[PDB]
């Protein structure tokens, strides 16, 4: 990301790989992520993942 | 998604303001008949009588 000002991006760029494990247990990309905003109040891709998915590892924090 | 990209503050511009109907009491005295449509066709016979 590049900043327009404190609060707004001059440019969101956001890219990478969406992956599947095959019955062989081999893995491939089946979709690319290819997002741009210029300005925005967020990043819909990342916003979406936090709302719909999870990290591959998480801390089991003690009480 | 449309909320998120624009952020929240913008939405006030589309959540349109609507008019509350404040009452309107009136001292409606009877509607004066039109001279031409109402009075005149009767006037020829009733004037001065």
Structural account:
The structure is cut from a larger assembly and holds chains A (63 residues) and B (49 residues). Chain A is 14% helix and 43% strand. Chain A is mainly beta. Chain B is mostly helical. Chain B has two helices and no strands. The longest helix of chain B is centred in the C-terminal third of the chain and has 12 residues. The N and C termini of chain B lie far apart (81 Å). The interface between A and B is small, with 6 and 6 residues.
Summarize the entry for a quick read:
Chain A is mainly beta and 63 residues long. Chain A is built from 1 helix and 3 strands.
Termini separation of chain A: 37 Å
Q: Major sheet of chain A, described briefly?
A: 3 strands, antiparallel
The biggest beta sheet of chain B, please?
A: none
Globally, the shape of chain B reads rod-shaped
Count the E strands of chain B.
0
The gyration radius over C-alpha positions of chain B equals: 28 Å
Structural category of chain A: mainly beta
Protein name (chain A): Fatty acid synthase subunit beta
Subunit structure (chain A): [Alpha(6)beta(6)] hexamers of two multifunctional subunits (alpha and beta).
Organism (chain A): Chaetomium thermophilum (strain DSM 1495 / CBS 144.50 / IMI 039719) (Thermochaetoides thermophila)
Family (chain A): Belongs to the fungal fatty acid synthetase subunit beta family.
């Amino acid at each position: 990301v590049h900043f327009k000002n404190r609060n707004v991006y001059s440019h969101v760029e956001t890219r990478g790989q969406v992956l599947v494990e095959l019955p062989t247990k081999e893995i491939i990309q089946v979709a690319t992520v290819e997002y741009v905003a210029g300005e925005s109040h967020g990043n819909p891709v990342i916003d979406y993942l936090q709302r719909n998915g999870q990290s591959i590892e998480q801390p089991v924090n003690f009480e | 998604e449309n909320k998120v990209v624009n952020g929240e503050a913008s939405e006030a511009l589309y959540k349109k303001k609507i008019i509350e109907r404040r009452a309107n009491i009136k001292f409606d005295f009877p509607p004066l008949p039109d001279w031409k449509k109402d009075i005149q066709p009767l006037n020829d016979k009733l004037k001065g009588m």
